[PDB]
Structure 1
């Protein structure tokens, strides 16, 4: 894997991207969570951007044959496009949800 850069680590979230068990009176801990949800959404979004870039190269590589040789990237990009979006932290900060409900 590509080594995590010195600049990258300076901004890596130290907390999981969640609001469960977060004391909202702890300013530092709440802003840490908000940053983790925001950063995670952007990563998923930037993942789609990289898949689109690969799909672009294969399309201009396979030409006529793109409808058959670019399906794997094609499927990946559509999955990311269907799921990844910068939605903010603020609905999840104000609304708790449970799986068992």
Structure 2
């Protein structure tokens, strides 16, 4: 199981293409990990609902709220926005 080292756009020189490729892949892989976390929360929520029935409103409130909170922020976003823009300036 592979665990490539994480690289940031902010550190590298855009003329070493190996570092730029690694930074792009790092960004994409981190987004996919975030998607995995969202899927974990959603699966737990489905299990809670199916075992709670009429009292899911009480027993799954935290999971429902957290899934709805993470839905807008835990999707794929690409790397081009961050590599082509410098947030400091």
TM (norm. structure 1) is 0.81
**Which residue, 71, 83, 88 being the options, matches 1:93?**
83
Q: Distance in 2 between matches of 1:23 and 1:36?
A: 16
Secondary structure of the corresponding residue to residue 65 of structure 2:
helix
* 1:20 and 2:39 correspond: no
**Which residue, 43, 56, 71 being the options, matches 1:53?**
43
Aligned length in residues: 89
Secondary structure of the corresponding residue to residue 39 of structure 2:
helix
**Which residue, 39, 55, 61 being the options, matches 2:29?**
39
Secondary structure of the corresponding residue to residue 82 of structure 1:
coil
Deviations 1:55-100 (A, max 9, x none): 00110100000000001111221121121121111111111102xx
Runs of 4+ in 1 over 2 A off after TM superposition: none
Q: Distance in 2 between matches of 1:56 and 1:15?
A: 33
Q: Distance in 2 between matches of 1:20 and 1:68?
A: 45
- Is the Cα–Cα contact under 8 Å of residues 15 and 33 in structure 1 kept in the other structure? yes
Task: Give structure 1 stretches of 5+ with no counterpart.
Answer: 1-6
Partner of 1:76: 66
